[PDB]
Symmetry: C4
Subunit: 362 residues, 4 copies
């Protein structure tokens, strides 16, 4: 089973940042030796649609569809609830198809009654016949506060089974569906990043909420490579040539914030510390997303995951403290330096740095 | 025999990218998380002079002149025919001189009756007396659809036997010949690349078709170095100092497309994957060329070469799919980023990046 | 005891430049093959407030607070006096609180009657009740010629005990204090550097004297990381994520000189040779500071520390000789080159290099 | 004896390029696949003051002063005469002071009656009482066609014995002397390079002929470091800190040619192949100088040195052939690329690349 195999390869093989980069090493937060605040007044609260959350971080969707997967969703959800952190579940297709797969998603809401919970379906489902009703069912199954629709064409190109399909018709349908839905749609990538062209196209169809999921964290091309190697599939060697395919997370954050200045933006793909999260937010994200390190702690257990979030939160407040940022808003506006390849990326892409400074700050 | 030794050194020694670079690591194709197409509608067909080809890739000229060499030409040709891929043969000098060497070229047309076949003579033959008749004989011997005239002065400088000769008279003669020939001439390098000054000089004599053959692939200075080492020739240590001599393929593509915007352009030299080929094309080439990796697979056998092309084609379509490029024309216009040394090369050479963008996409 | 532990970790663990950089490798002094002077006329004297000092180098504050610490202060003070070099003592808070800790500071003046001596208290003390009287007591204890107020929020974030406090009220108080004090105030960092924003805020409260204490020297985040590891404190792994936090010394010198052109500036944090000292001054510092390498020599003994200063002074004169700088003033105006990351830092931070050149030369 | 030790350290210890760089890796000669010439027509002749020389390369001054040194001067001189190559002798101070040292210089003219021979005294001699008469004696001793006056302040700073003296009076005297001398003066560095400031100051005193001697070849600071280590002298560690002190040869060539456009320029310091020599000349030098590798071959024997010059000349013609440069003039004008640190050096130093292109081409 593909869902089990995915979790096992992500958690126990070497695919985190494999031959790829976030370009976050190119972003420096300027240290403020006179912060102007004290540690105890640092306020980490922010908005997440109609709800308030305790920390500008979310867990992005990963799993569900059978009981061992549901027990990972349970650990993640009950810890996220405790910490006031939003949580996306993984793809719900399996539970649209099979009633026994429902509980492994529903459990999330039982144990996390108050945080934002975000449903999940894949864009390809929209050209294979999914419509309003499947979306409402994904949403109602966990009383979702939003639904994420994922883009994973890279993964689909290199996986043994099948071929990606991304006709514009899917966007027409998406646009129709968003007018009848009572919760917002977020469009997220899954390891390879969102460019300006893709963010503007999505915007022209009514999409305002993005999750970057850039290269440099979980490498889904590497994951499929490993599944190909395991079955002696021919594609393995081709996947290896594409290991560094994608938009780096930090470049993707800049590209979505610049091309759609009023977007609500999750910066994710390789966020591994509260310092990475602070960088993502100062660059222009509204919140930082994480998947893989949450998975690996959850598999270790509830208390491991509690420790993990304590660490992320401390690191984030440390960066806020050391930049003079009393709250999330001030963090979005703090002083940064951009160097090296990220800077060359932006310049070639016509990202005028002065208008960038202005846009990331309002 | 030099032809045999050449093939043996290229195939079995360490001379592929030896101390050299294509600069293709400096070209990035911008990933499109919503491609807007489906994998099965990707069309790879393109024009090659008066014929249509199935994939925008060619095999560039390598060998011929005796029976063991002819059997390599046979394998390559019958596989290229099967895949709808054009094929250049190696230098036909030896078959102009000796009737017995003819069959080792002619076999290409016997087993490949439909694809473009490209004949081959060296530029120095033009100052050693070759004229119209030798060109017509090269062409007729394989019913060629075109003839390539090669520039290899770097190789000639370091080889033990003789000295390069490139007087302008050769171009006058080339110019005369091209008005009496019923097929087009392509001018190609052989490892060291074509600059703007050389492309403009060639153009001023009526040459419109170029094949970059840049540094970063097969290193012909290294091949000669090794021939020198083998014979204890003094020049070996001098060849070693020139290992990184030449214009990197990526820079050569930019230089030719910029200095001659209506050229028909083969991007070649170090093309090892369908992703290299995609980059070569997006940069400004009309098609990608390959020699060495085709040689090494052909030596292994028919089925090894068939598998090799399946892999190149898949990698190419993967890059087209992940950039939203439904056909070769879309690929020539797709978004890219250029960074690092390639970017510094272009700036010092006066290649205004904005006018470059415009020129590479019409 | 924290003071003892600090000295032992700084002196005997690996924390000097740990994962951090001064960016001084990006500063090059232009060699002058015809210096225009002779070695023996080189004059290293310069002003330090109302006194004249023999060398434009100071020892910045480190220790004090018990007898073994006082014996280190004594060695450093008596050598500094012999060389005509100013000396800052470490934080005097402990001697405000406990009369027995006083002698370990006062010994500095007994043994060094003429050189400038610089008192020390931490900025957080100002929001914890310290004011005029404690400042006058720190000064009188050693008949100080100045008092340094230190910023160490990074160190405080990562240390096991407590939390940093840097409300603006501290600056209000500092500003009132400075009007009743009879010696100047210097504000220094302690390993993480001073930015333009912090220098400007400090300036707007009447502070004119700065000591950069940039990253790339003693890494106080690493020191607290090590104290955390030793106690099995959870923060250790978070400290490790921040090892390269802060403004590099060279960038901090540029930022302070640019944002406050008339400041009196100590360039410190990783000054390890007379060449680093020459670099700091040519970049815009008025004098170079050192802490750690003086400590390590002092622990070895009086004669070890004498040899250390002889080496620093020789290296500084060598750099003056090789740039044609007859005095400290000529050195501040000598030709330099700025390359690589320091150059990209300055550009992103809006430090126009031409106005920089003008400002650092006046 | 210092002369013997210097030769032994340079020839047999690791001091060539030690921790230093020429920046010539940053200069690329553009390859021309159609050279437009043939190898046998390449002409390497050029002027050297009033004489003609066969190759635009010289041996810069090294040794003399006793019989074993004289025998090295004899091998180098007789080979240079055979090849049509100018030769500078090392410092003649010892032969001004002691009549027995004379023959070890004079032998150069006996064995090389036609090529330019360049006499040698140090700049500090001019403030130590040398004047016209000592200059005429240096010149007459070998019937010199020119005299080189060397700048070696870096070497003097770090050597155990003494101190450097470069008062302006030396230039006043030099300026007087050049008006009574019947041959030209060349001012050369010796490992640390010539800047714009130094070139302009020299020029204002009537100096028109320069030899860059930049960092990246023989490292005179390292040589003195090694002499210090051997005697347990304290300066050793200080010398180690200055190993990368100086203007890289490539940068010095650009600085002298830009700041003094009509100068006659020897580009030297780390020239190790005829490709380095071609780079030096294309950058703006009129000729390339070499010292160290000539010494090492001469110590091996007459036939070793003859083979060395054959290698250098072949490499130089190869680079001329591969750039379409039929003569030394065309080479000075051929297409280049400048990248990386050399490019950043030039930009910070105000060397406008477009006016540079113009100036190096006349
Ligand atoms: C398996 C998935 C469903 C689609 O595949 P399919 O089998 O076709 O599905 P159907 O047929 O059932 O429709 C993935 C999609 O890649 C997915 N599951 C899932 C598994 C694991 C185990 C980890 C680790 C990450 C994902 N991520 C990306 C994750 O949310 C992050 O954006 C990236 O990992 C980057 O963040 P870091 O670097 O890790 O911090 C998921 N993203 C999705 O939106 N939905 C998911 O379910
Ligand atoms: C022998 C040749 C020319 C004549 O030499 P000579 O003995 O004086 O001949 P005469 O005229 O005197 O009879 C070579 C090129 O030197 C040549 N054969 C030849 C063999 C091998 C075995 C490989 C490997 C590649 C060449 N290539 C370059 C190839 O087409 C590609 O451009 C480059 O290899 C770059 O692409 P990659 O990086 O590899 O993907 C050929 N190019 C040609 O134009 N002509 C040829 O016949
Ligand atoms: C560690 C300290 C104690 C802080 O106070 P606390 O523990 O809260 O105690 P209370 O306030 O409660 O009393 C610091 C204060 O930051 C400090 N002591 C002190 C000890 C050691 C042993 C070395 C090595 C460096 C400091 N430095 C930085 C030094 O002056 C240099 O700026 C930097 O080291 C950078 O320069 P290099 O790279 O090394 O050349 C000092 N700086 C201060 O201004 N005062 C000090 O006392
Ligand atoms: C010892 C010297 C004289 C001054 O010393 P001193 O004891 O004060 O003398 P007095 O007091 O008696 O006057 C040197 C100067 O370093 C010198 N001898 C000398 C020896 C050898 C053994 C090598 C190797 C190089 C020199 N070169 C540098 C050479 O010409 C090149 O510029 C550099 O080597 C750079 O080019 P590459 O990288 O090698 O290709 C010479 N330069 C001079 O102008 N004159 C010399 O005599
Ligand atoms: Mg799928
Ligand atoms: Mg040939
Ligand atoms: Mg404290
Ligand atoms: Mg001398």
């Amino acid at each position: 089973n593909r869902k089990v195999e995915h979790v096992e390869i992500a958690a126990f093989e070497n695919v985190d940042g494999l031959s790829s980069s976030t370009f976050l090493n190119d972003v420096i937060l300027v240290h403020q030796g006179f912060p102007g605040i004290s540690f105890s007044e640092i306020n980490t609260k922010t908005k997440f649609f109609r709800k308030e959350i305790s920390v500008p971080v979310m867990v992005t969707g990963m799993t569900g569809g059978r009981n061992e997967l549901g027990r990972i969703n349970k650990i993640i959800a009950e810890v996220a609830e405790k910490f006031g952190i939003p949580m996306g579940v993984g793809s719900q297709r399996v539970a649209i198809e099979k009633a026994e797969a429902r509980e492994s998603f529903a459990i999330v809401r039982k144990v996390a009654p108050t945080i934002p919970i975000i449903a999940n379906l894949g864009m390809p489902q929209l050209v294979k016949g999914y419509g309003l009703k499947e979306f409402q069912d994904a949403i109602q199954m966990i009383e979702a506060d939003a639904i994420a629709v994922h883009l994973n064409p890279a993964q689909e190109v290199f996986q043994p089974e099948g071929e990606p399909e991304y006709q514009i018709y899917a966007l027409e349908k998406l646009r129709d569906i968003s007018k009848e839905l009572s919760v917002p749609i977020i469009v997220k990538e899954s390891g390879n990043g969102i460019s300006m062209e893709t963010a503007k196209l999505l915007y022209s169809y009514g999409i305002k909420n993005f999750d970057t999921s850039g290269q440099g964290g979980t490498n889904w091309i590497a994951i499929e490579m490993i599944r190909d190697i395991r079955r002696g599939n021919w594609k393995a060697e081709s996947a290896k040539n594409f290991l560094d395919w994608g938009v780096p997370t930090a470049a993707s954050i800049m590209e979505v914030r610049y091309s759609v200045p009023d977007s609500f933006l999750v910066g994710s793909g390789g966020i591994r510390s509260g310092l990475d999260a602070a960088k993502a937010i100062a660059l222009g994200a509204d919140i930082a997303g994480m998947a893989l390190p949450v998975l690996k702690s959850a598999i270790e257990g509830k208390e491991s995951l509690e420790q993990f979030f304590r660490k992320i939160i401390f690191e984030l407040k440390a960066a806020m403290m050391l930049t003079g940022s009393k709250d999330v808003d001030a963090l979005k506006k703090t002083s940064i330096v951009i160097l090296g390849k990220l800077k060359e990326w932006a310049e070639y892409r016509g990202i005028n740095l002065s208008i960038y400074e202005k846009v990331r700050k309002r």
